[PDB]
Design a protein around this ligand. Structure first.
Ligand SMILES: Nc1ccn([C@@H]2O[C@H](COP(=O)(O)O)[C@@H](O)[C@H]2O)c(=O)n1
Ligand SMILES: Nc1ccn([C@@H]2O[C@H](COP(=O)(O)O)[C@@H](O)[C@H]2O)c(=O)n1
Ligand SMILES: C[N+](C)(C)CCOP(=O)(O)O
Ligand SMILES: C[N+](C)(C)CCOP(=O)(O)O
Lengths: 469, 469
């Protein structure tokens, strides 16, 4: 098999297939996939048809898989206008939450960004694109890049974790040349890499450079991360990626992106395992209603996906394929164990064992920049609340965790409980909060938007439409 | 047609048919019907098969409908053991919430309760039945009944609205005789009654006496109120009854029971109208999930119900049938308008018109004993919260309603928001509560169980099973 990982695409539950396109950050607030589909009707099926039809295209070819700009252009056309930008300006903002100091350093060092005329710096959105107060690619002394990357990062934080102050204007000179150059470097380097980790590092390093060069007018994310990225992953015999936040392939470093991709691959493994074990899938605090599933099942239309669901992987060992991805993802195990536990662990006994002998600093630990986005500035408590992890929240409350701690968005465990509409988790926190003398001060905590937990609670489930009801 | 009201049984939406058996008080907390079915598996279908098979039995008979003890016994057998109690003791407790001063007066005046040896009074549950501190049927001076009925009622309140202090031990002498006597009185009196209101008064008066004489060892409620009661209602060309609390046919008066039955008939009219208008049915704060409906549709098994759904009422005018029930229920219109509005009204404009020119005493009005059970001791605010009436709660908040007022169970609008798990209504109340100086005092309000709103919120959706999860 040219793409042995296609086995995991087949194992992926049909009724949850949208999860490899819809960012996990949206699930709880937008009825899983519904909000993503309403923004661009037809976009889920087109993205699924694009992935499956091109993966089937590579598999049905004797020759060994080689990345090409024709491959990329076909992927863009399918996600839809098939052609590259020439002179067209493309820009976007980047919040602190989608950045890292090591990531900023690397981005400033991309020679094609300096020669291509790309711009990056602090500023404001203007009538025809960003109005830069500064552009870091103007007179950039390469010696100053480590110190400037620290400054840019602290400046992005000053504005707010989820707020956009920094803008990026892509390259407008020789996009076709850079596209071909990135492709050549990939094909040369991938052949060099011997281990799976080396391969992953090469893949993420190239996907990042493809994203940063924003070659298309639209759909760069879906093209490169939700499609392209999954092909070399499957080539390696790995599952495709289910992301919480895929929009990190600009200001994150290649090293930190390996971790981001591994966590995304782990999500797919949890999705498959839960479905196989007849367990109700609960990842990122989202429980799909039967109405949501039936609406998706009736909406689903992808012939190339149907061919993969009935594909013959009899001449392939699923056990060796399973043991290989388990070994590859084992690097995830000893990093922010309380945080990962609050996301993945549901067994009361495993949770109790994990929280044993842990101190006040470990239970209240807020992860710093560089970790995959969901962790940054968050306590295990914030993470239990967003994941619906009642067993973890109970253990944390028993461990005397501080529930008034605000994350980098100014949000407490109470703001997320209100935002997710969880009455039970909200009740547990409020029972705790009111048993302490500063109860009223804690309830009145305003986040970065000057909003209280009860302001969000008051807006929970409020229609997105102009309706009297 | 012998039972023209059968037309309304046909109009009743199949997927909501359980609503004429499951008390509206359970809906929000027990996933509509699920909790009722789990207490006695098979009990919903048996009750539906009993109603439809006997109604079909009366319709398929030339002779005019006459109540008989054979009819009653057949109904009991079908709800299941078909036979009457002889010597067997049957007892139950009655809380203040299921009583009225006028109702207590009438009950003490039932001559068959004195001669039959029934007991009623304050007390405690004992190993073999109640342990009476007093029995009002011992040396009852009929002159003292109005003053004693007031005392009994105030004593039942002292214990708590939803708490049981008063016990009733049914008749153990000549049940067969009283059953026949109640039946004869009914058949004689119904022929006397000329108007629909007179007929209703006779029906409720007799159903009450049948309930109070508890002739069966089990299922007296279902037999007499969910089955028997619906036959003369349909005979009159009226819809069957959908109740919030049917367990009022012991200590409520015949006059107050006409109102209880009219409100129950109005519920059926709202159910039918909402289904006909493709409106999602929301009565008593319960919105059925598609899983709940499909589980009920697959569980539903009643051949006699199937015959009624395809029955031919072509030789009957549905318009005259509709205009007659509208006239009959119009008595409901000018009683506790803010309360009924909080239950039934969803249109922002109608609600705003209704709350115009209303004072502080009208907006904060708590209904007294005698009204149908859902109203007693409740403000329009408590009622909006239990009904999910967001448009009414907004109007009430704008009208400066007091949200800290506790009902006869010691519960505030906040306790019901927590109990119903409504994040949005909870948020609205908390935004209000925190903007006032005594915020903390309001949140810490304990009901009759010494429980806070957040104690209930912490227990919302907690499993009823021994499960680790
Ligand atoms: N319908 C869509 C399409 C894209 N997106 C957002 O855009 C990201 C990918 O960017 P592209 O538009 O470049 O494909 C997604 O991860 C998601 O955050 C969305 O939110 N709804
Ligand atoms: N399965 C059942 C059957 C009856 N009930 C309760 O009993 C009442 C009727 O009493 P019976 O058992 O006499 O029929 C119902 O209105 C309801 O409150 C219940 O809660 N669950
Ligand atoms: C959000 N993003 C910066 C990762 C991709 C946006 O791509 P595009 O839609 O501008 O082409
Ligand atoms: C609850 N109730 C008093 C109206 C009826 C109980 O009847 P039963 O179940 O004791 O026969």
């Amino acid at each position: 098999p040219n793409l042995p990982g296609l086995y995991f695409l087949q194992a992926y539950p049909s009724e949850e297939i949208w999860r490899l396109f819809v960012d996990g950050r949206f699930w709880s607030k937008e009825n899983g996939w519904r909000g993503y589909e309403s923004r661009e009707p037809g976009c889920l099926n087109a993205a699924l048809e694009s992935l499956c039809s091109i993966a089937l295209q590579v598999e049905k070819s004797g020759e060994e898989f080689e990345l090409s700009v024709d491959l990329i252009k076909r992927i863009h056309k399918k996600c839809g206008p098939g052609e590259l930008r020439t002179d067209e300006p493309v820009s976007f903002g980047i919040p602190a939450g989608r950045a890292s100091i090591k990531g900023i350093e690397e981005f400033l060092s991309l020679v094609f960004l300096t020669e291509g005329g790309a711009e990056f710096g602090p500023g404001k959105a203007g009538p025809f694109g960003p109005r830069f107060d500064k552009n870091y690619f103007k007179n950039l002394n390469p010696e100053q890049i480590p110190d400037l990357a620290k400054q840019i990062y602290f400046d992005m934080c000053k504005y707010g974790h989820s707020n956009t102050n920094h803008f990026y204007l892509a390259v407008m000179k020789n996009v076709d040349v850079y596209l071909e150059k990135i492709t050549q470097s990939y094909n040369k380097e991938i052949k060099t890499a011997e281990t799976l980790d080396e391969k992953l590092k090469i893949i993420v390093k190239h996907i990042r450079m493809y994203e940063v060069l924003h070659p298309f007018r639209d759909a760069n994310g879906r093209t490169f991360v939700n499609n392209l990225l999954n092909i070399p992953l499957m080539q390696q015999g790995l599952p495709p990626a289910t992301f919480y936040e895929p929009n990190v392939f600009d200001l994150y470093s290649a090293e930190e992106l390996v971790v981001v991709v591994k966590e995304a691959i782990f999500n797919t493994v949890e999705i498959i395992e839960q479905s196989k074990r007849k367990t109700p899938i609960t990842l990122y605090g989202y429980h799909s209603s039967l109405e949501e599933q039936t609406k998706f099942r009736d909406m689903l239309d992808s012939p190339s996906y149907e061919k993969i669901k009935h594909m013959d992987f009899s001449d392939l060992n699923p056990e060796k394929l399973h043991l290989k991805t388990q070994k590859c993802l084992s690097s995830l195990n000893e990093q922010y164990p309380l945080h990962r536990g609050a996301i993945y662990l549901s067994d009361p006994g495993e949770i109790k064992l994990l929280l044993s002998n842990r101190n006040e600093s470990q239970i209240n630990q807020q992860i710093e920049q560089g970790a995959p986005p969901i962790y940054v500035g968050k306590t295990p408590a914030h993470l239990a609340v967003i994941s619906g992890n009642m067993a973890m929240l109970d253990e944390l409350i028993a461990k005397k965790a501080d529930l008034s701690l605000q994350d980098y968005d100014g949000k407490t465990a109470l703001h997320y409980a209100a935002e997710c509409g969880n009455m039970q988790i909200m009740g547990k926190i409020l029972k705790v909060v009111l048993s302490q003398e500063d109860a009223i001060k804690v309830l009145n905590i305003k986040d970065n938007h000057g909003k209280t937990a009860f302001h969000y609670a008051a807006e929970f489930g409020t229609p997105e439409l102009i309706s009297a009801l």
